[PDB]
């Protein structure tokens, strides 16, 4: 990544074994549960495109997802090249430069530390997160319509499942709110549904959950 | 976070893999036991709003609690805008709205600008205060037992009873009675001590 030194300068620092291992392990343990993406984003703070490629390439399994990601990246790189066409002077990055396949580390540093900066690391990271969003939505094991409180399931566990599914499905906030407004109470088990209906809509989730505790 | 480097200047530093992992693991192992909140507060020392949001977003489970927290955050942001109402001058610092403090409408660079301004606008500490208020409400909700259900067992050592009592009290409070719920023998000794006895004296007496 790029870090600030004591001279106030932005300089390259090798990716650490701790970061590498952390990313490999989160993919191994969590696959494409939604929380993998904020973890990716946090572990790649200040990353160059080379570093981002290191993180993706050290992943051993899940090669269907990795190939889909690669196709998303190539689409975003093509859109960049459509919108941003290209001695001792600094050239402009094309899409494959931002994705780190046709650019050198030194060029990436040059762009990221230039004044004004061309933040190729953050641009590529945006593309990667677009692809990961699509994978997380695709690999979601359950539909929100199929989340229903069991006769003996605690309301808290049901709501946990409901909102985990909703998080993975990645609908707009209006669609999410429509789900919260109809399906959540609708699909509670009979007793909880009675109490929640007595409370009426516009009750907060905290009030609902206390009422069914 | 924003930290002072070895030469005394306030600079942004990426959240570390150790911090990230420590927070994820404490939530996985302890859920919302009360001691999770002081840990959160320490692990986010110097955090920007972006860092706080990273810590909250890396939590995989407890999505019901995360929705409750989000509601608390929005309520606090609304109160902020009610009490601190706010184009921009070129190259000048704007004032943060509630949604700026929560990191939803502000950039990392703006957050750094506010936090390193002279005097500083401590958006990270304000946001952290909102988050901790929500977390306290969640802790109180996940408390499994009421203090009324903590009674000393017939042959329960007084120390174990006191441990359970104050464990329960801590969780239920998050957002005289000890003696009354002791078993008969201990209760007699304790009331024999009279008022103004310290916990140490009480525990010694029933040991």
């Amino acid at each position: 990544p790029i870090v600030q030194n004591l001279q106030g300068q932005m300089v390259h620092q090798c990716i650490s074994p701790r970061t590498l291992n952390a990313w490999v392990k989160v993919v191994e343990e969590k696959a494409f549960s939604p929380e993998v993406i904020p973890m990716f984003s946090a572990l790649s703070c200040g990353a160059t495109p080379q570093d981002l490629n290191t993180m993706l390439n050290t992943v051993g399994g899940h090669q269907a997802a990795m190939q889909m990601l690669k196709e998303t990246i190539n689409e975003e790189a093509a859109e960049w090249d459509r919108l941003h066409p290209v001695p001792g002077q600094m050239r402009e990055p094309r899409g494959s430069d931002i994705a780190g396949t046709t650019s050198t580390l030194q060029e990436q540093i040059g762009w990221m530390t230039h004044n004004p900066p061309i933040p190729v690391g953050e641009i590529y990271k945006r593309w990667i997160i677009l692809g990961l969003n699509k994978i997380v939505r695709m690999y979601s094991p359950t539909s929100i319509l199929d989340i229903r409180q069991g006769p003996k399931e605690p309301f808290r566990d049901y709501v946990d499942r409901f909102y985990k599914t909703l998080r993975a499905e990645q609908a707009s906030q209006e669609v999410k709110n429509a789900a919260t407004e109809t399906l959540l109470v609708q699909n509670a088990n009979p007793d909880c549904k009675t109490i929640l209906k007595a409370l009426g809509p516009g009750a907060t989730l905290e009030e609902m959950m206390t009422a069914c505790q | 976070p924003i930290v002072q480097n070895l030469q005394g200047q306030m600079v942004h530093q990426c959240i570390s893999p150790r911090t990230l992992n420590a927070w994820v693991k404490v939530v996985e192992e302890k859920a919302f036991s009360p001691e999770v909140i002081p840990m959160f507060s320490a692990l986010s020392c110097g955090a920007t709003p972006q860092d706080l949001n990273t810590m909250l977003n890396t939590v995989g489970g407890h999505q019901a609690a995360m929705q409750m927290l989000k509601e608390t955050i929005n309520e606090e942001a609304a109160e902020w805008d009610r009490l601190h109402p706010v184009p921009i001058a070129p190259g000048q610092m704007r004032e943060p709205r509630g949604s700026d403090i929560a990191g939803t409408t502000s950039t990392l660079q703006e957050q750094i600008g506010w936090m390193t301004h002279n005097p500083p606008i401590p958006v990270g500490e304000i946001y952290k205060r909102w988050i901790i208020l929500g977390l306290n409400k969640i802790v109180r909700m996940y408390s499994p037992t009421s203090i009324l259900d903590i009674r000393q067992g017939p042959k329960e050592p007084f120390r174990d009873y006191v441990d359970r009592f104050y464990k329960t009290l801590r969780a239920e409070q998050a957002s005289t009675l000890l003696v009354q719920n002791a078993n008969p023998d201990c209760k007699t000794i304790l009331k024999a001590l009279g008022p103004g006895a310290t916990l140490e004296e009480m525990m010694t007496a029933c040991q």
């Binding site: 990645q170 906030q173 | 709003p49 706080l52 995360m66 929560a102």
Partner: peptide, 9 residues
């Protein structure tokens, strides 16, 4: 197009 998974911020 998915809305993303960043619940906070």
């Amino acid at each position: 197009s998915p809305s993303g998974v960043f619940t906070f911020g």
